[PDB]
Structure 1
Amino acid sequence: NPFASLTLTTLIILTIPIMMSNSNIYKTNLYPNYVKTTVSYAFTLSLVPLLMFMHTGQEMIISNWHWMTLQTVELSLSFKMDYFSVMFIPVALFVTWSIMEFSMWYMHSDPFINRFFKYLVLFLITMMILVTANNLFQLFIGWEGVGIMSFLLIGWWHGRTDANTAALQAILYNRIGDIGFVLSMAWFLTHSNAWDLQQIFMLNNECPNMPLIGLLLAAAGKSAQFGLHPWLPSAMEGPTPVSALLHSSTMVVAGVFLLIRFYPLMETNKLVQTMTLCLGAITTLFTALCAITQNDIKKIVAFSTSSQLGLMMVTIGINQPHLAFLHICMHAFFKAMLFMCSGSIIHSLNDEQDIRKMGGLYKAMPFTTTALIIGSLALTGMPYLTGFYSKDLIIEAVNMSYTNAWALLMTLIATSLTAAYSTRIIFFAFLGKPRFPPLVLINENNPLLINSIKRLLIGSIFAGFIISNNIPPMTVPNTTMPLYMKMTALIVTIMGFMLALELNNTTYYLKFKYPSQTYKFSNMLGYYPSIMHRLPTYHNLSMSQKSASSLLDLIWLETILPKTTSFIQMKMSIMVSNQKGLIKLYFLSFLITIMISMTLFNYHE
């Protein structure tokens, strides 16, 4: 009985700050603190549904208000309380509340801080009704509200045209993904004759070829997988809290959240899983490959996010939906720390964000030092931490299954690279010598930072256990396996630590570095942004003018029908009016008209 009311309030009470903002009663200053309290109180409100869940396990559907009685179709406002929904809510509110604390630290000179916090809340609503959506239309409501707000959020400072370019690029790649979303809606409404998710599961589409690939394409959009990946690394162009919240822990994982919510239908078709293993594999290799040799402080970790996304959707690839949801909570915990920690050192280091000028901050900023090391260790899978309970359990699961041959080697090799850039980011940014500008203004003693990092810090240390034990067993436990690949989830990260450490040390060895061809490949993001953002965009839009606008509309279409008939009347209307005026010529013509009438054509005859 309580379950319906408490979770619904967690949605409703999240929107009052938006309406108060429109009321303009807030006299600035207090508004960001007012927003934080609402989100924090939303989190505390969101607990008691979660503690309810493990006690019994009840999962409800809260279809409340009827929208369309569209013949046999019954569109209504429907929220599905399920394990994926009721558990992701406090995790989502936890990260967004702590970073709401962080946003005041970083942006204190921003004159539009109130608009920023309002934007953060408005996204939270659009994501909230996405994660808890029972009918597909509400999923699109979240699917599109979140994408639009990215365009507003990472395009915060309109300012530099590169920010708008990232805004146009991010929405365009997201625009490509939802083409499959619309395809799935058309297929479900036509064949399954419904849009609510649970009815589609009931009707048992045992051969859902077209809807599933469209759903896979939709996930490829928001999760920034191959084809549609480069919008994630370019999304760093906005404020770091935007990049720390939206597309590091919350938005990008929402694409993966679509496939898991459709898992009861997905596993029926064996073929649809082969590209999920295919897509997630190569994405992990490529995104980690770029992160190895990148330099921007946010580029390294942003690529790590996409590499993580490829890893977790590989799991739902090999019949591991719930384990993907297990990763959805751990990854949102420590990855926010890594971005928030980078945001902290950016602000202290006179907004400098290139590892070549970091270094020596291990002792200058110890609190951020401790957070990143144990944050990265969770990211690398330190046993009995938040990361290990998901990542290494996943590796133990994927390698032991009927899957594509090499497809188990990215998640093996990428994990080695996953640990590799973690060592590089630790070595360059914090270890080494202090290569930063001589004037030191660094400081992290503000309590707003210390509490913000600490809130997820005990999370990034102790969450792993407090989700692993309480949740009911919903996957088959891997019990008997060989020793080598059961430990390989931990071994692989060891040479990831080892080889990268030696390679990072090569910078200490005093000898010039030759530019390798493979190094050049990794520095340009693997050449994808250089080409795909130059050739296809130029050719299609050049056609929009040379062929589309100038050739057809302005020339051809307007010269075929209208101007031809205009000229046809024009061409010989001249001598229709141009007559010499001689009575001879007029009356001679009257002669011919007489003869043609009664002799040649002979109307009489």
Structure 2
Amino acid sequence: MNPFASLTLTTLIILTIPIMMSNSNIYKTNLYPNYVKTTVSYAFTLSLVPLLMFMHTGQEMIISNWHWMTLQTVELSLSFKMDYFSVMFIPVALFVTWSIMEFSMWYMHSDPFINRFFKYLVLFLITMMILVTANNLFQLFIGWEGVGIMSFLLIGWWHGRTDANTAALQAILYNRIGDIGFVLSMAWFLTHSNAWDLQQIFMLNNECPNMPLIGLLLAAAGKSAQFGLHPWLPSAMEGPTPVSALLHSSTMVVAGVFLLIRFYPLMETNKLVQTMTLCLGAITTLFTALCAITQNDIKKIVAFSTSSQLGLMMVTIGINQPHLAFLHICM
């Protein structure tokens, strides 16, 4: 317990250091993309070690250090729950971003703001890591909106791109539709369960999570581009090609799915709510793939496939395959 949890805290702060150097205007804007390479590759390098003891003894814990709000009966503090899902996803996420922005250095080089560009991928990375390394829904909400507004800015990378602005406008709009269920779950947990941290909610034995489960389902539906909340994910392809090999490639879209497996202790309780997931996931698999079957693009088709895939793992969540779904996401 001397390694692992401490190492994770080291990993999630060293990724912020590029931003701290960026805002300090002491960094050199020329090699900053390459400087970003070294940070992400190193942050990936220190991301392997937290796996080692999890393979060894499988220890899991929650880090809650600095108490933010007391709010009478409900104390609030920044808190990361490192479990199976979070621990091995960080190297998977870290390895992906290091490679994709390695490619993006050669690709995304004919633009004046490549320094500002690579900084934005960094600002996605800590928001996504805030989401996955979370212990109460509010921090996950912090990452949820952070990546959503991050997509808004990244999709609209060309502020003169009218289509990208519309896609970004649709990008957050559908994402805010998802948060309506997040807010619904947020209110129910603070009222019926009177808790925000993940641990208490699961073990309070909320054997009537009907409305929260719908709220959780709606949240994942918006984030994971379910039917009715799908078209923003294809729309995000309008931005630069690396941006399509980014947040919406396979990173941000699965955040809602990660929320679904997160709440699997209570997710299995209601067979009804258990059902409607694999339904909507199944329709996405057919419909989005059907659109990609007769189509005239490359990124769009594989974007439609991603939504079809994004419909796949949470179908398994609908059939109570949480860990298997998470394995599928990383694959």
Q: TM-score range by the shorter chain?
A: over 0.9
Structure 1 residue 268, shift from structure 2 partner: 1.1
Structure 1 residue 108, shift from structure 2 partner: 1.4
C-alpha separation in 2, matches of 1:229 and 1:318: 22
State the structure with bigger RCO (CA 8 A, min sep 6), 1 or 2. 2
Whether 1:311 aligns to 2:309 is: no
Q: Where does residue 70 of structure 2 map in the other structure?
A: 69
C-alpha separation in 1, matches of 2:31 and 2:21: 12
The answer as to whether partners of 1:136 and 1:196 remain within 8 angstroms in 2 is: yes
The answer as to whether partners of 1:14 and 1:125 remain within 8 angstroms in 2 is: yes
Cα deviation, 1:289-312, whole Å, max 9, x if unaligned, reads 001011111111100100001011
The answer as to whether partners of 1:130 and 1:142 remain within 8 angstroms in 2 is: yes
Q: Where does residue 100 of structure 1 map in the other structure?
A: 101
Cα deviation, 1:312-349, whole Å, max 9, x if unaligned, reads 11001101000100101xxxxxxxxxxxxxxxxxxxxx
So what's the TM-score if we normalise by structure 2? 0.98
C-alpha separation in 2, matches of 1:292 and 1:270: 33
Structure 1 residue 125, shift from structure 2 partner: 0.5
For this pair of structures, how many residues does the alignment match? 328
C-alpha separation in 2, matches of 1:293 and 1:65: 54
Q: Where does residue 537 of structure 1 map in the other structure?
A: none
Structure 1 residue 163, shift from structure 2 partner: 1.0
Cα deviation, 1:218-257, whole Å, max 9, x if unaligned, reads 0001100011000011110111111111111100011111
Please give the secondary structure, in 2, of the residue aligned with 1:2. Answer: coil
Q: Where does residue 149 of structure 2 map in the other structure?
A: 148
The answer as to whether partners of 2:131 and 2:139 remain within 8 angstroms in 1 is: yes
The answer as to whether partners of 2:44 and 2:91 remain within 8 angstroms in 1 is: yes
Structure 1 residue 25, shift from structure 2 partner: 2.1
C-alpha separation in 2, matches of 1:272 and 1:310: 15
Cα RMSD of the aligned pairs, angstroms, is 0.8
Structure 1 residue 128, shift from structure 2 partner: 0.5
Please give the secondary structure, in 2, of the residue aligned with 1:80. Answer: strand
Structure 1 residue 180, shift from structure 2 partner: 0.3
The answer as to whether partners of 2:127 and 2:147 remain within 8 angstroms in 1 is: yes
Q: Which runs of 4+ in 1 moved over 6 A?
A: none
Structure 1 residue 100, shift from structure 2 partner: 1.3
The answer as to whether partners of 2:108 and 2:242 remain within 8 angstroms in 1 is: no
Structure 1 residue 2, shift from structure 2 partner: 1.2
Please give the secondary structure, in 2, of the residue aligned with 1:97. Answer: helix
Q: Where does residue 116 of structure 2 map in the other structure?
A: 115
Structure 1 residue 28, shift from structure 2 partner: 2.3
The answer as to whether partners of 2:8 and 2:50 remain within 8 angstroms in 1 is: yes
Structure 1 residue 29, shift from structure 2 partner: 2.1
C-alpha separation in 2, matches of 1:212 and 1:164: 33
Please give the secondary structure, in 1, of the residue aligned with 2:252. Answer: helix
Structure 1 residue 202, shift from structure 2 partner: 0.6
The answer to which structure has the higher strand fraction is 2
Cα deviation, 1:89-122, whole Å, max 9, x if unaligned, reads 0000000000111111112121000000110000
C-alpha separation in 1, matches of 2:169 and 2:298: 23
Cα deviation, 1:445-477, whole Å, max 9, x if unaligned, reads xxxxxxxxxxxxxxxxxxxxxxxxxxxxxxxxx
C-alpha separation in 1, matches of 2:261 and 2:200: 16
C-alpha separation in 2, matches of 1:256 and 1:71: 32
Q: Where does residue 285 of structure 1 map in the other structure?
A: 286
Q: Where does residue 207 of structure 1 map in the other structure?
A: 208
The answer as to whether partners of 1:280 and 1:314 remain within 8 angstroms in 2 is: yes
Structure 1 residue 26, shift from structure 2 partner: 2.7
Cα deviation, 1:561-604, whole Å, max 9, x if unaligned, reads xxxxxxxxxxxxxxxxxxxxxxxxxxxxxxxxxxxxxxxxxxxx
Please give the secondary structure, in 2, of the residue aligned with 1:78. Answer: strand
Structure 1 spans left out of the alignment, 5+ residues: 329-605
Please give the secondary structure, in 2, of the residue aligned with 1:177. Answer: helix
The answer as to whether partners of 1:285 and 1:307 remain within 8 angstroms in 2 is: yes
Structure 1 residue 27, shift from structure 2 partner: 2.8
C-alpha separation in 2, matches of 1:197 and 1:308: 27
So what's the TM-score if we normalise by structure 1? 0.54
The answer as to whether partners of 1:95 and 1:245 remain within 8 angstroms in 2 is: no
Structure 1 residue 4, shift from structure 2 partner: 1.6
The answer as to whether partners of 2:267 and 2:273 remain within 8 angstroms in 1 is: yes
C-alpha separation in 2, matches of 1:59 and 1:151: 35
Query: Which has the greater radius of gyration?
Result: 1
C-alpha separation in 2, matches of 1:76 and 1:51: 28
Structure 1 residue 9, shift from structure 2 partner: 0.6
Cα deviation, 1:425-448, whole Å, max 9, x if unaligned, reads xxxxxxxxxxxxxxxxxxxxxxxx
Structure 1 residue 127, shift from structure 2 partner: 0.3
Q: Where does residue 216 of structure 1 map in the other structure?
A: 217
Q: How does 1:157-556 map to 2 (within 5 A)?
A: 157-328=158-329
C-alpha separation in 1, matches of 2:77 and 2:23: 27
The answer as to whether partners of 1:225 and 1:306 remain within 8 angstroms in 2 is: yes
C-alpha separation in 2, matches of 1:150 and 1:40: 23
C-alpha separation in 1, matches of 2:242 and 2:87: 25
C-alpha separation in 2, matches of 1:193 and 1:24: 44
Between stretches 23-32 and 176-185, larger displacement belongs to: 23-32
C-alpha separation in 2, matches of 1:20 and 1:84: 31
C-alpha separation in 1, matches of 2:27 and 2:10: 23
Structure 1 residue 213, shift from structure 2 partner: 0.4
